[PDB]
Coordinates of C-alpha atoms in Angstrom, one line a residue:
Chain A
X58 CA 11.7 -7.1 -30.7
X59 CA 9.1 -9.9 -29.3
X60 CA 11.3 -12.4 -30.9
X61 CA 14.0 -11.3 -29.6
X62 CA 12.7 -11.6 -25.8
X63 CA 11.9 -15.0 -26.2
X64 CA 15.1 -16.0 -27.6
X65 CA 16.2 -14.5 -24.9
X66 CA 14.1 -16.4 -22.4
X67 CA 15.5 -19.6 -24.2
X68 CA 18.9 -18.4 -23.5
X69 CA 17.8 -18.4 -20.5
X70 CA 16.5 -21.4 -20.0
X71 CA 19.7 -23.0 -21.6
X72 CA 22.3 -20.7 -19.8
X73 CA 24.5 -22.4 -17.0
X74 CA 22.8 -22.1 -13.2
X75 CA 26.1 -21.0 -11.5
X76 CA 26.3 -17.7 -13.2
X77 CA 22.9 -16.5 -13.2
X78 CA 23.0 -13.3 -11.9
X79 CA 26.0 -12.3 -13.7
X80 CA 25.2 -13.2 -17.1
X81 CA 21.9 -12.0 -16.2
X82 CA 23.2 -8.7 -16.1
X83 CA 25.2 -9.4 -19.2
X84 CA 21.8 -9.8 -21.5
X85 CA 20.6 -7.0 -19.8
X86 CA 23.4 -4.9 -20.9
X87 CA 22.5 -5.9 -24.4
X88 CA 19.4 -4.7 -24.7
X89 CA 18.7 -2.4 -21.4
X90 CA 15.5 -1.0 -23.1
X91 CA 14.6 -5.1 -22.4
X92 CA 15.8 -5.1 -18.7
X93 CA 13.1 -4.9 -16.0
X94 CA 11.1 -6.8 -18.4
X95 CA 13.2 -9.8 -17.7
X96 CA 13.3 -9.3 -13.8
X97 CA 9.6 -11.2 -13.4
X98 CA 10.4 -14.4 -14.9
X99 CA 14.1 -14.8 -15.2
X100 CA 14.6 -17.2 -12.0
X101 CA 18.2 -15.6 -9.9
X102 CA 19.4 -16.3 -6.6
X103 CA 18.5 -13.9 -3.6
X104 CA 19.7 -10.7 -1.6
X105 CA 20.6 -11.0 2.2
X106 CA 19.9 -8.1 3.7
X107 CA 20.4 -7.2 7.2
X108 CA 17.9 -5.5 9.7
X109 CA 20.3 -3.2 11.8
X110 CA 17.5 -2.0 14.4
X111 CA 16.5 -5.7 14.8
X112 CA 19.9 -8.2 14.2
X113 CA 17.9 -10.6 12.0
X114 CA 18.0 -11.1 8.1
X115 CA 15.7 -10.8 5.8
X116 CA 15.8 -11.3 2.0
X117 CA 15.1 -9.2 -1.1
X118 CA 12.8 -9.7 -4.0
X119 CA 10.2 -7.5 -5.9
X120 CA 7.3 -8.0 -3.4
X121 CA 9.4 -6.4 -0.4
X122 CA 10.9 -4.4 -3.2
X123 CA 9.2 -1.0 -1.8
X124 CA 10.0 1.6 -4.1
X125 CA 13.4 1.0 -4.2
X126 CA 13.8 -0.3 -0.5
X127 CA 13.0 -3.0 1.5
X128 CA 10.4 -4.1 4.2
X129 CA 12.1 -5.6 6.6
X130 CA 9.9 -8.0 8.2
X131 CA 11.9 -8.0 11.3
X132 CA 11.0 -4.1 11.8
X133 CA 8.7 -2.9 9.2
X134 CA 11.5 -0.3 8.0
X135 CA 12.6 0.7 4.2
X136 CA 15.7 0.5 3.6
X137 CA 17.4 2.6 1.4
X138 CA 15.4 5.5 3.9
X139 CA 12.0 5.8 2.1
X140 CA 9.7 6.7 4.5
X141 CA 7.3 7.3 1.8
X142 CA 6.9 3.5 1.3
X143 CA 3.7 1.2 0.8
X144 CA 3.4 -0.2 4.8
X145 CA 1.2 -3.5 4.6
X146 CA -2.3 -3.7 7.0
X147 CA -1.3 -3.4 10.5
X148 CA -3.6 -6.7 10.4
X149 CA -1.5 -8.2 7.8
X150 CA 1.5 -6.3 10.0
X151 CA 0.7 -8.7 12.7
X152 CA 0.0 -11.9 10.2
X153 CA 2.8 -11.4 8.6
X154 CA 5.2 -11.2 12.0
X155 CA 3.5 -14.8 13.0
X156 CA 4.3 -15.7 9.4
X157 CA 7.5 -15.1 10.2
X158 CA 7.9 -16.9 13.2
X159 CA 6.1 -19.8 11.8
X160 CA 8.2 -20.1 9.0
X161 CA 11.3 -19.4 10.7
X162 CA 9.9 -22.3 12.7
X163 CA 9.6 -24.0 9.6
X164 CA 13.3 -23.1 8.3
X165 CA 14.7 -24.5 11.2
X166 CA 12.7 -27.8 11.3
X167 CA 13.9 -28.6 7.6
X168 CA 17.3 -26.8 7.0
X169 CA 18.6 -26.3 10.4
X170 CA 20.1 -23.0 9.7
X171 CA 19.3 -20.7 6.5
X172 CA 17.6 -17.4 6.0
X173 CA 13.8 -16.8 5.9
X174 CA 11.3 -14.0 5.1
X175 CA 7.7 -14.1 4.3
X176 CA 6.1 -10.6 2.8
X177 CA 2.4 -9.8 2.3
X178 CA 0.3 -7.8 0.8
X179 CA -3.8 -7.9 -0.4
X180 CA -6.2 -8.7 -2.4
X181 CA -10.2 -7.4 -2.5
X182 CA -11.4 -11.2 -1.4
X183 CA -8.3 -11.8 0.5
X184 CA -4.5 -11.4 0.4
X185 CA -1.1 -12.5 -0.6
X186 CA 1.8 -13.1 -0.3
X187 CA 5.5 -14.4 -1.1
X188 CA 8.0 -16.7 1.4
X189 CA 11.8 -16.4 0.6
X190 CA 14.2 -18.9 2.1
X191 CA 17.6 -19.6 1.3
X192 CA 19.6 -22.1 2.5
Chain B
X148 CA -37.4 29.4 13.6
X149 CA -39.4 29.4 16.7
X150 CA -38.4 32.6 18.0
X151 CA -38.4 34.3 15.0
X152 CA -42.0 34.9 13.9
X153 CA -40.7 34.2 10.4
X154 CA -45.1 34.1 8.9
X155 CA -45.5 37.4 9.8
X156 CA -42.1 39.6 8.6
X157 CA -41.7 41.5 5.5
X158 CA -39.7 39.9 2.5
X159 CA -36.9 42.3 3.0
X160 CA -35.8 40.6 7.0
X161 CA -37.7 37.6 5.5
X162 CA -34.9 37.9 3.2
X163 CA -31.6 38.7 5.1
X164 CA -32.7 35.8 7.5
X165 CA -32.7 33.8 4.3
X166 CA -29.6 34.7 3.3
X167 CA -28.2 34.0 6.6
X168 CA -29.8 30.5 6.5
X169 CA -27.4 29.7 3.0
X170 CA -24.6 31.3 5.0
X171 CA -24.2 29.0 7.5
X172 CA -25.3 26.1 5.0
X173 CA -22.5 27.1 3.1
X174 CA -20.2 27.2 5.8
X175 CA -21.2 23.5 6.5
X176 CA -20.5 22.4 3.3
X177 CA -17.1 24.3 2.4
X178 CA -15.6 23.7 5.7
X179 CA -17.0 20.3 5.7
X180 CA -15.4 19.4 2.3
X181 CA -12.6 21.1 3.9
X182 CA -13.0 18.2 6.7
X183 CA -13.2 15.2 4.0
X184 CA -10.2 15.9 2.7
X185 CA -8.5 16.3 6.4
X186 CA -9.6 12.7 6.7
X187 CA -8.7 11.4 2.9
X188 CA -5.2 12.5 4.1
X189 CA -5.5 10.7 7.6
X190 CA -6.7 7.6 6.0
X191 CA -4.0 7.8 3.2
X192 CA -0.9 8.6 6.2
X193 CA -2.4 5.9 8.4
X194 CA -2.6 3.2 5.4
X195 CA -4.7 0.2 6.7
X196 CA -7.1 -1.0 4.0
X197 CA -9.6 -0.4 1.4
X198 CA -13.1 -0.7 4.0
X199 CA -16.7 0.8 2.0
X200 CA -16.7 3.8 4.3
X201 CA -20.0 5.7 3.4
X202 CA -19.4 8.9 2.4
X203 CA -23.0 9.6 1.1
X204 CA -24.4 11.4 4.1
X205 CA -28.1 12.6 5.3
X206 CA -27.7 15.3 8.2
X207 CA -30.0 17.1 10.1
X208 CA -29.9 20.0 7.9
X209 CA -30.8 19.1 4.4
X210 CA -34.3 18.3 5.5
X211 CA -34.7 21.8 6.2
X212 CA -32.8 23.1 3.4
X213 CA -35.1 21.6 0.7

């Protein structure tokens, strides 16, 4: 069923980009032995979420995707409750906060208003990480 | 090992004192693999990073033991 993933990717590629996540979920329902095989390079929209300790945003993807819940970057918190999740370096915990700020910094410079989130995570040489912004 | 004029004993204290020795040796390294795995646990609930802690230690005792 190789073939049939990338005609799938070409469908895609040549579906309409206002109804992404819908029919998204469509071609998953086809073939849902295919389906988080298609959510790493089948290009959606994003998830607000909203950090209720903190009274920020933050937005989802797979790199905050923590199990099955989120890191908020405003708090360090999962959510769903999974206190059981993969924290980042408290040095990387405090890199990633200025990331934040710097980007939120960033955000408001270009799109004066939108939502932001940078995540992070390592590498042996280094480390990584993702920035989400939605305007 | 000073005070107790091991070079001069009989094998059978010579012996028990011996056996004694591994005791406590043996309570070093049970309790003390007892401890490593206290700390894999306290480095695995504190999560901070992947550092080349040396694990491969020489104490004072081993040079005695061999």
């Amino acid at each position: 069923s190789d073939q049939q993933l990338d005609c799938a990717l070409d469908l895609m590629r040549r579906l309409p980009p206002q109804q992404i996540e819908k029919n998204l979920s469509d071609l998953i329902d086809l073939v849902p032995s295919l389906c988080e095989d298609l959510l790493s390079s089948v290009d959606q929209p994003l998830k607000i979420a909203r950090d209720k300790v903190v009274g920020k945003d933050y937005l989802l993807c797979d790199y905050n995707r923590d199990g099955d819940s989120y890191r908020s970057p405003w708090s360090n918190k999962y959510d769903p409750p999974l206190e059981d999740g993969a924290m980042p370096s408290a040095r990387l915990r405090k890199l990633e906060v200025e990331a934040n700020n710097a980007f939120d910094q960033y955000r408001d410079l270009y799109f004066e208003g939108g939502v932001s989130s940078v995540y992070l995570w390592d590498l042996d040489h280094g480390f990584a990480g993702v920035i989400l912004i939605k305007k | 090992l000073g005070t107790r004029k091991l070079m001069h004993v009989a094998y059978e204290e010579f012996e028990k004192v011996m056996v004694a020795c591994f005791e406590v040796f043996q309570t070093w390294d049970d309790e003390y693999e007892k401890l490593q795995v206290l700390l894999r646990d306290i480095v695995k609930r504190k999560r901070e990073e992947n550092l080349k802690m040396v694990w491969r230690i020489n104490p004072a005792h081993r040079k005695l033991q061999a």
